[PDB]
Design an enzyme around this catalytic site. Sequence first.
Site, mmCIF file in Angstrom:
data_model
loop_
_atom_site.group_PDB
_atom_site.id
_atom_site.type_symbol
_atom_site.label_atom_id
_atom_site.label_comp_id
_atom_site.label_asym_id
_atom_site.label_seq_id
_atom_site.Cartn_x
_atom_site.Cartn_y
_atom_site.Cartn_z
ATOM 1 N N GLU A 35 -137.620 16.591 -14.459
ATOM 2 C CA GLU A 35 -137.294 16.853 -13.066
ATOM 3 C C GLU A 35 -138.486 16.583 -12.146
ATOM 4 O O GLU A 35 -138.332 15.970 -11.096
ATOM 5 C CB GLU A 35 -136.806 18.294 -12.851
ATOM 6 C CG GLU A 35 -135.407 18.559 -13.364
ATOM 7 C CD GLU A 35 -134.286 17.813 -12.668
ATOM 8 O OE1 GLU A 35 -134.655 17.205 -11.567
ATOM 9 O OE2 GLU A 35 -133.143 17.794 -13.109
ATOM 10 N N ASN A 46 -132.850 14.204 -0.180
ATOM 11 C CA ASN A 46 -131.627 13.457 -0.375
ATOM 12 C C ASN A 46 -131.041 12.993 0.962
ATOM 13 O O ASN A 46 -131.223 13.599 2.011
ATOM 14 C CB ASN A 46 -130.617 14.364 -1.091
ATOM 15 C CG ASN A 46 -131.169 14.813 -2.444
ATOM 16 O OD1 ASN A 46 -131.522 13.995 -3.279
ATOM 17 N ND2 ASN A 46 -131.245 16.114 -2.636
ATOM 18 N N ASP A 48 -127.953 13.228 1.750
ATOM 19 C CA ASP A 48 -126.911 14.147 2.152
ATOM 20 C C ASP A 48 -127.469 15.304 3.009
ATOM 21 O O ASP A 48 -126.721 16.182 3.420
ATOM 22 C CB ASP A 48 -126.119 14.707 0.975
ATOM 23 C CG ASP A 48 -126.921 15.752 0.182
ATOM 24 O OD1 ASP A 48 -128.131 15.838 0.319
ATOM 25 O OD2 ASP A 48 -126.256 16.418 -0.672
ATOM 26 N N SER A 50 -129.686 17.508 2.015
ATOM 27 C CA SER A 50 -130.286 18.501 1.149
ATOM 28 C C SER A 50 -131.616 17.971 0.572
ATOM 29 O O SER A 50 -131.898 16.772 0.645
ATOM 30 C CB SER A 50 -129.339 18.839 -0.005
ATOM 31 O OG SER A 50 -129.311 17.810 -0.997
ATOM 32 N N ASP A 52 -134.308 18.706 -2.990
ATOM 33 C CA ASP A 52 -134.568 19.327 -4.275
ATOM 34 C C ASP A 52 -136.035 19.779 -4.303
ATOM 35 O O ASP A 52 -136.931 19.004 -3.959
ATOM 36 C CB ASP A 52 -134.358 18.320 -5.408
ATOM 37 C CG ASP A 52 -133.032 17.580 -5.326
ATOM 38 O OD1 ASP A 52 -132.028 18.165 -4.978
ATOM 39 O OD2 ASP A 52 -133.055 16.356 -5.624
ATOM 40 N N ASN A 59 -131.763 22.531 -5.722
ATOM 41 C CA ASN A 59 -131.232 21.949 -4.499
ATOM 42 C C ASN A 59 -130.877 23.001 -3.429
ATOM 43 O O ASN A 59 -130.389 24.094 -3.695
ATOM 44 C CB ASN A 59 -129.987 21.140 -4.889
ATOM 45 C CG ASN A 59 -129.393 20.364 -3.735
ATOM 46 O OD1 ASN A 59 -128.401 20.784 -3.106
ATOM 47 N ND2 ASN A 59 -129.993 19.235 -3.407
ATOM 48 N N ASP A 101 -124.583 32.120 -13.005
ATOM 49 C CA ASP A 101 -123.417 31.761 -12.173
ATOM 50 C C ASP A 101 -122.504 30.706 -12.912
ATOM 51 O O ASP A 101 -121.630 30.140 -12.308
ATOM 52 C CB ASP A 101 -123.801 31.289 -10.781
ATOM 53 C CG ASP A 101 -123.915 32.442 -9.738
ATOM 54 O OD1 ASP A 101 -123.505 33.516 -9.998
ATOM 55 O OD2 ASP A 101 -124.336 32.057 -8.549
#
Length: 129
Positions: A35, A46, A48, A50, A52, A59, A101
């Site tokens: 990563e 990103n 979009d 967002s 990371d 994210n 989650d």
Amino acid sequence: KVFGRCELAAAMKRHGLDNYRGYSLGNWVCAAKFESNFNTQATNRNTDGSTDYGILQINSRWWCNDGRTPGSRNLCNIPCSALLSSDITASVNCAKKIVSDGNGMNAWVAWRNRCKGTDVQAWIRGCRL
């Protein structure tokens, strides 16, 4: 900070990741290697809107709040800046939340591409734990 594998392994173990929800320490170290290359300050911005963040590239849509991302859920209940700390507390606690989650380590693209199905023990081999 840019960790070594064994140093990160020991820190992650102290923070309770070894075998957390059935994922061995080597899985977590491998995920961080691919990563972020073990760099606590890593960012990936990103298209979009967002981003990371940190050594596990978590994210900002679902997991942390950066104030700039559409659809924010902030499920880890932290600003994303906490994920850029040199100490790994916030990143580990948020990683635990992601899995707890109901996500698998599948949530980490680099883990699925580069760790799943392999001899991940190699990433902790020889380390003082």
